[model samples]
Target: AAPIRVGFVGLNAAKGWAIKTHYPAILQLSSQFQITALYSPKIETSIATIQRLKLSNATAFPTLESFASSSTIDMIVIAIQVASHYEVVMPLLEFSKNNPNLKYLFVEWALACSLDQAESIYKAAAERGVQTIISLQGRKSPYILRAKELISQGYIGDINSIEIAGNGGWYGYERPVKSPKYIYEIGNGVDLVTTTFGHTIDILQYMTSSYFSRINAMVFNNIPEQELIDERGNRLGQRVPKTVPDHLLFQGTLLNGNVPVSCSFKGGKPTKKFTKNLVIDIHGTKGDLKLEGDAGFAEISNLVLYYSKEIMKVYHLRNYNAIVGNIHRLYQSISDFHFNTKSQFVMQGFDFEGFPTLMDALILHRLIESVYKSNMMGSTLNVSNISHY
Candidate 1:
C-alpha cells in the first residue's frame, strides 16, 4: 500500500496520546505514514508543543473545523474526552460518508465507564458504521496472548477457579491534571472499575474467551472527602469533597461453567511495594496451576507459571512474558521514543502497521461496558455485540 497521511484532532496535541503514542508512532514510520495535520483549541500551546516535540511536517490548526475541512488530510485520529467523544467522532463519520474514501479513527480511553453509557455510544457507532477502537492498552501485550493459549491447551486442566490480588489507588498513580469532581459521584462509574480493574477484566475475558455472567460486589470510597492538591505538590488552597469510592472489592462469574473469579483493589494510600503483584491460581479437576511474579500494570511482564503442584514433581515453570522475557520486544515497540519532530527533527513512531478502525475501538468499549454492568446490576452482562463471530 502507498504511504498514508495521518492527522490529529484533540485538546492537547502534545501532552496525551497525540504525543505519547500517535505522533511518535507516525514519525517512526515516516517511510510508511506521514504526519500531516493537527487540530487543537489551544493553538499556541499546541504549536509550542509540536515545536518542542519537533513535529514540523504536521501543521497545528486553530480549530477542528478547519482541519476537518482540509482536503489535504486523508485520515483524522481523535483522542479526546469521554463525554465529548461521540460529539467529535460523529462529525468525522458524516465526513467519511460524504467522502467514501476518507476514514476517521479515534483512540478513546473510556477507562472505567458505566455499561449503560458504553452501550449508548457503541450502538451509535454501529448504527453509523463508524470505524474505531477502545484503548485498553494492556490487551495489546503479547504475554497476554501466550497466557490465553496456555489455558486453551489444558495447561491448567479443566479450570475451576482463579484468584487475582492487586492493590493501588492513591499510591501507584499520578495526577497530571485536576480531574473533575463529578468523577467522585456515587454510581458515577469512573474509578478503579473503569481504569485498573478494566485492564484485568479484559485480560480475563480474553483468557477465558467467555463472558461475565454475574457479579456480587462491595464497592466503596475510602476517601470521601480530602484536600485536593496541585501538580506542584502545593495546596490548591481548598478541600475538595470526593464522592467516588477509592477502594473496590469485586466477585464475579464468567460464562465458562460454575467457576468463581475475584479481583480486589485498595485506595487512600500509596505503596511502593508493587503497584500490582498478582498470583493467578487456576485449579482444574485433575491438577492445579499457579502464575506468580512481578507482573506489572499491563499484566504482561514478569510472568512465571508452575504447571503442577506435586511435591516430588520437578516444577515445570514457564516464563512467557517476563519483564525481561520474550514479550519485552513488543513492549519496546509500544514505548519506542524515536520519531520525526518539527523541533527535534525526528523521533519514534507507532508500532502497529497502521491506524485502527472504529469497529475495533467499539468492540473494546463493549467489553469494558460488559464488565461494568456485571458489577452494577448484580449480574453478568452479555457481550454479544463484542463477539465478532
Candidate 2:
C-alpha cells in the first residue's frame, strides 16, 4: 500500500482540533496517506470542511451509512467530543457486522469519557476484529521516548520514586469564551482526572516500564466556579459551575509496590516559580532523571531532559511545529507498522515504541477510574487489579 486512503470524522469549516493536528499530519504524510473523504453530523457542512482545509479531491459523506460503505477510504481518523465517541463508533461497529472488511483500520482521539464507555468500545472493536490506534500525544513524544531509552539502558539502576507536577493551560477557574462547555462537565472525561491524569500517568509508566500498583488520590475543585473571558482579555458576565477537579494530589506505587510515585497537578498554567507545564523527577539507585516541558498537556516538542546533577540535551523538533510534529511522528509509525516500511525517523535509532493501541488506552482509562475511586473511597486502592477486559 503506497498511500493509505484516509477519511476524517470531525473536520469543520474554520476551526477545530482535527483541523489543527490531524489535518496537518495527513498533509505531512502525503506520501503514505491521502485525505479522501470527510463526514459531518449535518452533511451540508462536509463540503465546506474539505474546502476550508483545501483538500480538493475529498468526497463528502452525508450519513454514517454512506461513510461506512465507501470503498475509497482504507482507514478513518476520529476527533470529536469524548462523550459522543461511543455514540458515533458503536453504530459503525454494528454496521461492520455485515461487512467484515468495513474500513478495518481506525484511529481514535482519546480513550473514552468513562470506564463503561471505554470498555464498550474495547469490546465492540475486539469482537469485530478492528485494528485500532488511540491517539495519545504523550505516547508519541520524542522526549518521552528519549527518557524511555535512557531508563532501558539502565542509566538509572532501579526506580525508587517518581515525582510529577504539571498543569494544563486551562480547565481551572476560567476558560476561553470560545471553548466547548462540555469540558467542564464532570460526567464527561475531559476533566483533569481523565484527560490530564491519563496523559501524565501514561508517560510515567511508558518511560519507566512499570505499572501503577496502588493509589490514594484527592480530586477536588479548589475553585468552585469558573469565570468566562474572551480572548481579548475581557471577563465575560456569565459565571459557570465547574464540577471537575482543578486540583489533584495522588501518591502511588509501581511494579507491585516497589517504586513510589507522587503527583501534584492544578489545571491552570503555572504562574509562579514553577513556570513549566510539566516537571518529572525520577529518582533511582544509580542516578536521577528529570524532564521539563512547557506543553500544557505534559507532552512537548521542546522538552529538556536531564541526568542526575548533569545537564543533558534539550529535545526540540526543529523541522516541524511542536504539536503538529508529534502527531506526524505518530502517523509515521502507523504508516510504517501498517505498510511494513521504515520511515527515515525510525532509522534514526529513535526506537519505535509504536503508537498507543486500543488495549493500551483501556488500561490507562482503567487506572484513571481507579484514581477517582480511591479519592471517593478516601483510601488507597490497588490499581494492578484493574483490567482492560
Candidate 3:
C-alpha cells in the first residue's frame, strides 16, 4: 500500500499532545504514513518540528490554508487546541474544492468547541467527500479489546452493572503555569471533564457497545481558584479563576442491555504511585470482572483484569504500541476505502469498524452537553432529550 501523505496541523517540538503521541505514533508506522508538511499557529514551531523529526521530505507551512492546499499532502491531522479545531479545518476543507489530494481528515478527539461545530465539520467533510477519523484511539488498547472480548464471550454472565472511578490526573489541587491557558477556561472546551473523562467514557461505551439511556450528572469546580506555579516550583505570580468543572460524577443506564452504569472522576495528582487511580467493576449475575489501572486513560495505563475464575491477569501490550496501533488502524481504514471506492465518491464519511469517527465525536459532544444540562436542571436527563444536531 502506498503511504498516506500526512500534513500535521499542530506539531510543536517542546510540549503538546500532538508532539507527545501523534508524532511518535506516526513515526512507528513510517511505512504507512509519510508526513509531508507541518503547520502551527507560529511558523517557528512548524520549522522546529521538521528539524526535530529530521523530516527532509516535509515542509513547514506558515498557515493551514497553504498546507491543506498542497497537492502532495493526502490527509490532515488536526491536533490543534480545542477551540481552534473548527476554524482551522473549515478553510482547509473548503480548499479541498480544488485539491483532490486533501481527501482525508484525522481530527483529534474533542473534535470541536461544541457539538454544533463538530456536526458542521462532519457534514462538510461528508459533502466534500473527505474520509474522516477522530482520535478516540484509546478504544484500540489491547487490554480494552481483551476486556470487550471477555464480556462478549460471557466471562461474566449477564452484566448487571458497572462502576468506574478514576483520578483525572492534574487540574485538581494545583494548576501548572506551563499548562495552556485555554485549559483553564470553559469556553475553550478543553477541560478535565472533556479530555480526561471524555476519553474514559468513550472507552467504556466502546467496550460495552452501549449508549446511555438516561444520565444524572454532578459537576464541580472544587478548586474555585488556582495558583499557577512554574516547573521550578516558583510562583508565576498569576491566579486564574477556574470555571470549568474539575470533578465529574454521573450515573446512567445502557440502552442495549439496560445495564446500570456509574462513573466518578476527580482531577488531581495521584496520592501514591501504586494507588490504582482508575478502576472499573463489572458485576454480573454469575461472576464479576474488575479492570484496574493507574489512570483511567487506557492508552498509557498498565491495565490488569481480575475475574472471579481467573484471579489476576496482567495485560502487557506488545511494545506498548497501543497509540501507534490505533493510528495505523485508521490509516488502514483509509487504505481500505481507497481500494473499495475504485474512484467512487461513496467513500465519504466511511469509518473502520470500531475506529472512532466524527460521528463518535458528535455523540461524545452531546453526552457532555447532556451532563451539563442534567447538572443545571437537577434532574436525570434522557440522552435522547439532547438535540443530536
Best by TM-score: 2
Model 1, span 1-389: residue lDDT tens? 44456677763644553455555545545665666777776788767766776665778877666666666665566666555555665565555454444443445456224555555555555665534444444445554555666677776567788777654444222332376655555444445656556656656666666656655565665565666567886555566566655666777676677578886766534543643365556677666666554432454345555555353122323544332232223223322311321121111112232222343344455655555455577664444445463
lDDT of candidate 2 over 1-389, digit per residue (tens): 46878877887757767777778888878888898878789888998777766786699998886786677777777777777788888886675455444443454545678888888888887777656777776767777887888888888777877899877556666677888778777787688877777778888888887777778999877777788889996789778877778888989888633788889887784343646767899988887888877665765446777775554444555454657877888888787777765421111112344567677788877888888888888999877766422
TM-score of 3: 0.88
Looking at candidate 3, the ten consecutive residues that score lowest on lDDT are 342-351
Tens-place lDDT digits, model 3, residues 1-389: 68878888887877777776777767766777788988788898788778877886889987767777778888888887878888888888887676867767788878887767877887887788766677876676667777778777787788899999877676676777767666778878687777888888877877776777988999888787878788886677777887777788889998868899988887775344655788888888767877787655655566777776445455554345554565555555556566463243332121225356676777788898888888899999878544344
Candidate 1 displacement at residue 142 in angstroms: 2.2
Candidate 3 Cα deviation (angstroms), residue 146 = 0.7
* Model 1, C-alpha of 153: deviation from truth (Å): 2.2
**Model 2: runs farther than 4 Å from truth?**
97-104, 309-320, 342-352, 387-389
Model 1 clash tally, residue pairs: 38
Residue 167 alpha-carbon offset, candidate 2, angstroms: 0.8
Clash pairs (backbone) in predicted model 3? none
C-alpha TM-score for every candidate: 0.71, 0.91, 0.88
lDDT of each: 0.54, 0.74, 0.74
